[PDB]
């Protein structure tokens, strides 16, 4: 009654269930469908399913762990950027904040009525997460190498370098898998990874 | 975000009221520092324009003194420009604790190696001496202006950071604490009323 | 004690301030000032200004008003208090408060 | 319940007990035992015992009152300095802060598991407190006289010349009555007071 999760019924419910999906009214004010909080939710069943997810994929655990780490570090940095005013930022900090913004706007958001995300199977999820995590890794490695030696790469530089690739990355979600073939989208995302690799080689 | 995370209770009411009082005292104390800083800013800018006008006219004094030194001597320019070995005027950097923040300043130093002597330029040493006096006085006033200008430039960012801190304090935390206290008072009222009603129902049941 | 005022000026102002005692040859045997004549280029002047800025042993600099105008963007690209930079007028260019980087920092204070 | 005054029982017993001995939770976390608040506590037996301590000692009352004043001024300056990061610690503030910090460290905490701390009589307490007020008085007098006249004395020259005196003053705590008689320890206190006098004369 009112979102207060300390009310008696939710308190009795949280002790018995195994998976819990806390939801946030602020996100729903943003129309951030689905308005899940992704920070107080949890699920005790991960350990029992890691075996399955390895017997089919074997390439998900790093993705999940890095996603949790980046989101957690963004949340920690939220206070520091709120008070400071977005000035006292090392380049890695800006990188993680902005990649967190991209993942939140892209992977986390999803419309529940438009034909192209009425449904989304697992493989596309894996593809998108792999794309975004790989981009994070390459961006930070390039910035580290250019930071230690000389000409520290600012985030504005990579932004102006590959804004088009960022735009393609975000617009990845327009697929409607029902019509298009799975391998077609897999090759599409491989092509975007090729684009990112080419850009990072040219900057290299 | 909009409510500091704690379980409502009476003790919690005491701690939150104390934290609000601490924030208020911090805000007042910051306001006092901002008052002092803007006072320093205003007093620094008070007569920088005046002293700069004095600078301009004194430079013009030295300028037409040079114009008259162009008369008796002649082509002294290259003779002087070649004769360059050591300085007789130096910067002795000091400090100026204008406020809680310290800004560096400067001091006019006569190092000791006297100004050189050119007695051969067709025997015009007097004009050169008065020109020396003119430019010496000018350089004194100029080191004073440099100290002032350094303090001004640093004190600007000092004021900016102080103002940002007081603003962030007065427009973030105080409303948050106040809303938390409102919620706490409401919860305490709820909890007492539940007991009131249930006690009443015991009372009524005991009549039978 | 350790820091020396440096002058970037035309011939007359340079003679004037060498005459007032300002002037040294360091261990490297170079002048701590620059002469400005009619025939100079803004680009090498800017590189010499950068030579001044980066060198630690200056503190305060003294540049004429039209000479400081000739290098205005590169002059204002620097914002640090310890390398103080101060403007002065000249014989044909009396002092102008409307043209000054620091007084431009004091925006709306007129 | 909860370590505060909210409960009716603690309120009621507080309202009829003559002497309250409130114990700090934070000082209990600091392990400077005994963890007494020294600020939320009281006792309505000062005035009666004034007559007793005048008839026998003639010295305890002003020393004790000054001890409270100096400790409290340290508390207030602590409440002030939190924001400015101790930048505005003047000379007199520095003397007060250091004096009360010494009172905290050496003469407001004992080790019940050692022979020199399991019990301090009245006279021993009075001697240590007299010594504290003594060096405070002399230091304040010196700094004031020199600031008024010429060549102000700051805490740096004070630490330089009389480090031995301050070390001896901290080491009064270890004048073991269990292994030494009263005569030795009392003569030690007097001789350290005279050493402090001589050193201050030297620095005058």
PDB file of C-alpha atoms in Angstrom, chain C:
ATOM      1  CA  UNK C   1      64.940  35.164  -3.856  1.00  0.00           C
ATOM      2  CA  UNK C   2      64.675  32.691  -6.748  1.00  0.00           C
ATOM      3  CA  UNK C   3      62.078  33.913  -9.259  1.00  0.00           C
ATOM      4  CA  UNK C   4      62.710  36.688 -11.786  1.00  0.00           C
ATOM      5  CA  UNK C   5      60.322  39.059 -13.548  1.00  0.00           C
ATOM      6  CA  UNK C   6      60.471  38.720 -17.347  1.00  0.00           C
ATOM      7  CA  UNK C   7      59.518  41.247 -20.033  1.00  0.00           C
ATOM      8  CA  UNK C   8      58.112  40.703 -23.534  1.00  0.00           C
ATOM      9  CA  UNK C   9      58.147  44.184 -25.024  1.00  0.00           C
ATOM     10  CA  UNK C  10      59.102  46.410 -27.917  1.00  0.00           C
ATOM     11  CA  UNK C  11      62.542  48.004 -28.039  1.00  0.00           C
ATOM     12  CA  UNK C  12      61.791  51.126 -25.976  1.00  0.00           C
ATOM     13  CA  UNK C  13      59.962  49.393 -23.119  1.00  0.00           C
ATOM     14  CA  UNK C  14      62.641  46.691 -23.105  1.00  0.00           C
ATOM     15  CA  UNK C  15      65.409  49.249 -22.741  1.00  0.00           C
ATOM     16  CA  UNK C  16      63.348  50.950 -20.055  1.00  0.00           C
ATOM     17  CA  UNK C  17      62.989  47.826 -17.937  1.00  0.00           C
ATOM     18  CA  UNK C  18      66.551  46.619 -18.483  1.00  0.00           C
ATOM     19  CA  UNK C  19      67.444  50.082 -17.230  1.00  0.00           C
ATOM     20  CA  UNK C  20      65.336  49.535 -14.110  1.00  0.00           C
ATOM     21  CA  UNK C  21      67.348  46.418 -13.237  1.00  0.00           C
ATOM     22  CA  UNK C  22      65.143  43.707 -14.748  1.00  0.00           C
ATOM     23  CA  UNK C  23      67.382  41.333 -16.650  1.00  0.00           C
ATOM     24  CA  UNK C  24      69.523  38.229 -16.341  1.00  0.00           C
ATOM     25  CA  UNK C  25      71.375  35.584 -18.266  1.00  0.00           C
ATOM     26  CA  UNK C  26      70.664  32.211 -16.649  1.00  0.00           C
ATOM     27  CA  UNK C  27      73.066  29.249 -16.574  1.00  0.00           C
ATOM     28  CA  UNK C  28      71.915  28.422 -20.112  1.00  0.00           C
ATOM     29  CA  UNK C  29      73.017  31.932 -21.221  1.00  0.00           C
ATOM     30  CA  UNK C  30      69.760  33.213 -22.704  1.00  0.00           C
ATOM     31  CA  UNK C  31      67.839  36.477 -22.253  1.00  0.00           C
ATOM     32  CA  UNK C  32      64.844  36.414 -19.928  1.00  0.00           C
ATOM     33  CA  UNK C  33      63.068  38.864 -22.262  1.00  0.00           C
ATOM     34  CA  UNK C  34      62.066  39.184 -25.905  1.00  0.00           C
ATOM     35  CA  UNK C  35      62.423  42.102 -28.298  1.00  0.00           C
ATOM     36  CA  UNK C  36      59.428  42.980 -30.477  1.00  0.00           C
ATOM     37  CA  UNK C  37      60.094  44.809 -33.739  1.00  0.00           C
ATOM     38  CA  UNK C  38      57.861  45.474 -36.734  1.00  0.00           C
ATOM     39  CA  UNK C  39      58.777  42.200 -38.477  1.00  0.00           C
ATOM     40  CA  UNK C  40      57.649  39.327 -36.266  1.00  0.00           C
ATOM     41  CA  UNK C  41      55.130  36.496 -36.614  1.00  0.00           C
ATOM     42  CA  UNK C  42      52.407  35.581 -34.127  1.00  0.00           C
ATOM     43  CA  UNK C  43      53.263  31.874 -34.293  1.00  0.00           C
ATOM     44  CA  UNK C  44      56.883  31.943 -33.128  1.00  0.00           C
ATOM     45  CA  UNK C  45      55.867  34.658 -30.658  1.00  0.00           C
ATOM     46  CA  UNK C  46      53.304  32.191 -29.302  1.00  0.00           C
ATOM     47  CA  UNK C  47      55.955  29.461 -29.103  1.00  0.00           C
ATOM     48  CA  UNK C  48      58.227  31.834 -27.171  1.00  0.00           C
ATOM     49  CA  UNK C  49      55.285  32.677 -24.907  1.00  0.00           C
ATOM     50  CA  UNK C  50      54.899  28.950 -24.281  1.00  0.00           C
ATOM     51  CA  UNK C  51      58.631  28.793 -23.561  1.00  0.00           C
ATOM     52  CA  UNK C  52      58.004  31.454 -20.936  1.00  0.00           C
ATOM     53  CA  UNK C  53      54.926  29.750 -19.465  1.00  0.00           C
ATOM     54  CA  UNK C  54      56.502  26.317 -19.127  1.00  0.00           C
ATOM     55  CA  UNK C  55      59.763  27.631 -17.659  1.00  0.00           C
ATOM     56  CA  UNK C  56      59.421  27.586 -13.883  1.00  0.00           C
ATOM     57  CA  UNK C  57      61.683  30.514 -12.970  1.00  0.00           C
ATOM     58  CA  UNK C  58      59.512  33.500 -14.018  1.00  0.00           C
ATOM     59  CA  UNK C  59      56.519  34.143 -11.766  1.00  0.00           C
ATOM     60  CA  UNK C  60      55.377  37.466 -13.264  1.00  0.00           C
ATOM     61  CA  UNK C  61      55.499  38.609 -16.892  1.00  0.00           C
ATOM     62  CA  UNK C  62      55.119  42.120 -18.334  1.00  0.00           C
ATOM     63  CA  UNK C  63      53.608  42.504 -21.819  1.00  0.00           C
ATOM     64  CA  UNK C  64      52.443  45.667 -23.577  1.00  0.00           C
ATOM     65  CA  UNK C  65      48.795  46.228 -24.447  1.00  0.00           C
ATOM     66  CA  UNK C  66      48.938  45.925 -28.227  1.00  0.00           C
ATOM     67  CA  UNK C  67      51.620  43.247 -27.876  1.00  0.00           C
ATOM     68  CA  UNK C  68      49.231  41.333 -25.627  1.00  0.00           C
ATOM     69  CA  UNK C  69      46.422  41.928 -28.119  1.00  0.00           C
ATOM     70  CA  UNK C  70      48.585  40.513 -30.915  1.00  0.00           C
ATOM     71  CA  UNK C  71      48.575  37.271 -28.916  1.00  0.00           C
ATOM     72  CA  UNK C  72      45.137  37.286 -27.262  1.00  0.00           C
ATOM     73  CA  UNK C  73      43.738  33.770 -27.729  1.00  0.00           C
ATOM     74  CA  UNK C  74      46.995  32.015 -26.844  1.00  0.00           C
ATOM     75  CA  UNK C  75      47.515  34.477 -23.986  1.00  0.00           C
ATOM     76  CA  UNK C  76      44.039  33.774 -22.572  1.00  0.00           C
ATOM     77  CA  UNK C  77      44.362  30.023 -23.077  1.00  0.00           C
ATOM     78  CA  UNK C  78      46.298  29.939 -19.776  1.00  0.00           C
ATOM     79  CA  UNK C  79      44.572  30.097 -16.367  1.00  0.00           C
ATOM     80  CA  UNK C  80      46.989  29.644 -13.472  1.00  0.00           C
ATOM     81  CA  UNK C  81      47.798  32.108 -10.712  1.00  0.00           C
ATOM     82  CA  UNK C  82      51.486  31.293 -10.111  1.00  0.00           C
ATOM     83  CA  UNK C  83      52.526  32.354 -13.640  1.00  0.00           C
ATOM     84  CA  UNK C  84      51.016  35.797 -13.201  1.00  0.00           C
ATOM     85  CA  UNK C  85      50.702  37.720 -16.472  1.00  0.00           C
ATOM     86  CA  UNK C  86      50.231  41.490 -16.355  1.00  0.00           C
ATOM     87  CA  UNK C  87      49.418  43.968 -19.117  1.00  0.00           C
ATOM     88  CA  UNK C  88      50.953  47.429 -19.480  1.00  0.00           C
ATOM     89  CA  UNK C  89      50.309  50.210 -22.010  1.00  0.00           C
ATOM     90  CA  UNK C  90      52.776  51.707 -24.500  1.00  0.00           C
ATOM     91  CA  UNK C  91      53.564  55.117 -25.980  1.00  0.00           C
ATOM     92  CA  UNK C  92      51.019  54.834 -28.810  1.00  0.00           C
ATOM     93  CA  UNK C  93      48.556  52.492 -27.009  1.00  0.00           C
ATOM     94  CA  UNK C  94      47.503  53.939 -23.628  1.00  0.00           C
ATOM     95  CA  UNK C  95      45.928  51.621 -21.102  1.00  0.00           C
ATOM     96  CA  UNK C  96      42.579  50.025 -21.987  1.00  0.00           C
ATOM     97  CA  UNK C  97      40.534  48.240 -19.326  1.00  0.00           C
ATOM     98  CA  UNK C  98      38.101  46.851 -21.904  1.00  0.00           C
ATOM     99  CA  UNK C  99      41.004  44.800 -23.332  1.00  0.00           C
ATOM    100  CA  UNK C 100      42.358  42.584 -20.560  1.00  0.00           C
ATOM    101  CA  UNK C 101      41.991  38.855 -19.901  1.00  0.00           C
ATOM    102  CA  UNK C 102      41.788  39.112 -16.122  1.00  0.00           C
ATOM    103  CA  UNK C 103      39.268  41.959 -16.218  1.00  0.00           C
ATOM    104  CA  UNK C 104      37.377  39.755 -18.677  1.00  0.00           C
ATOM    105  CA  UNK C 105      37.316  37.096 -15.957  1.00  0.00           C
ATOM    106  CA  UNK C 106      35.571  39.743 -13.831  1.00  0.00           C
ATOM    107  CA  UNK C 107      32.526  39.624 -16.080  1.00  0.00           C
ATOM    108  CA  UNK C 108      29.687  42.038 -15.426  1.00  0.00           C
ATOM    109  CA  UNK C 109      31.791  43.917 -12.847  1.00  0.00           C
ATOM    110  CA  UNK C 110      31.369  47.309 -14.494  1.00  0.00           C
TER     111      UNK C 110
END
